[PDB]
Amino acid sequence: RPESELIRQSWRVVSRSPLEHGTVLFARLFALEPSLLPLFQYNGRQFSSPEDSLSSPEFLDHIRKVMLVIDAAVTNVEDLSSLEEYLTSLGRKHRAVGVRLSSWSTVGESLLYMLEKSLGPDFTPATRTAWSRLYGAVVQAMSRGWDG
Ligand code: HEM
């Protein structure tokens, strides 16, 4: 595949400042779906507003965790199945936190938003398509975490 290098090359820019870029992702996420804000429970309390989350060291640590998992997916873009068991457990964890299957689509849109804003003219339709495919594979693995 050639869209693997598309992924690697587009990730390079954002991966140098992962907290700054992940902050865009989460600000976008809460703008689109405010009901995700209460899922964070640090110190047994709920954030009132999205800007409250940005003041929380624990919340910012989670942004770094998110960006590191995406980095693992990019690293293994030609061979994701290697992350399947890890992602299944990560999905199970998030289901327990309260994330629902539908919310992963909003996370996906927030990731694409953050890439679009960072890459500008370099966010080509092929780049969008490559990322949608990679993210979709990640969500498919995480969704194995759920049970029916
Ligand atoms: C609606 C979206 C999300 C919500 C509400 C959410 C919430 C949480 C919460 C409450 C925790 C436990 C506290 C913590 O460790 O900070 C957690 C852990 C974690 N999250 Fe998320 N998260 C979301 C999205 C993501 C995404 C997209 C990723 C990676 C692609 C991710 C990766 C992780 C990791 C690696 C942990 C630590 C898991 C562990 O304990 O082993 N999260 N998340």
Side-chain angles (χ1 to χ4, degrees):
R1 67 267 272 28
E3 73 183 8
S4 289
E5 194 58 30
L6 234 41
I7 297 285
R8 295 184 195 101
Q9 178 195 343
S10 57
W11 185 240
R12 190 182 205 185
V13 193
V14 306
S15 78
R16 304 187 189 119
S17 50
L19 180 62
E20 290 169 34
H21 285 96
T23 291
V24 174
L25 192 162
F26 279 87
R28 177 68 169 174
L29 181 62
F30 292 146
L32 295 177
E33 189 172 330
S35 60
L36 290 170
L37 182 68
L39 296 185
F40 299 91
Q41 295 185 23
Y42 308 117
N43 296 346
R45 290 210 269 183
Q46 197 178 128
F47 298 126
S48 286
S49 302
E51 65 269 24
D52 291 320
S53 71
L54 297 182
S55 72
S56 165
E58 307 96 300
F59 181 83
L60 301 176
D61 290 336
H62 175 266
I63 296 181
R64 295 183 182 283
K65 300 174 193 194
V66 171
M67 297 297 276
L68 255 332
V69 172
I70 299 169
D71 192 63
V74 171
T75 287
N76 291 274
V77 66
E78 310 235 18
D79 34 337
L80 280 305
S81 65
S82 303
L83 296 178
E84 184 168 76
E85 292 305 314
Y86 170 79
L87 292 172
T88 295
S89 67
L90 186 66
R92 191 177 298 110
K93 170 65 170 182
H94 282 85
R95 170 176 146 242
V97 155
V99 183
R100 314 187 74 88
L101 291 178
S102 64
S103 297
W104 295 123
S105 300
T106 314
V107 173
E109 298 286 8
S110 300
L111 170 63
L112 295 174
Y113 169 83
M114 180 277 290
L115 293 163
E116 170 182 339
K117 299 303 297 189
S118 185
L119 296 162
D122 293 339
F123 183 74
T124 65
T127 303
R128 181 192 191 291
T129 296
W131 274 101
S132 183
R133 294 189 107 252
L134 173 59
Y135 182 74
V138 169
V139 174
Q140 178 75 1
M142 281 195 306
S143 298
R144 293 170 102 262
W146 269 253
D147 300 359

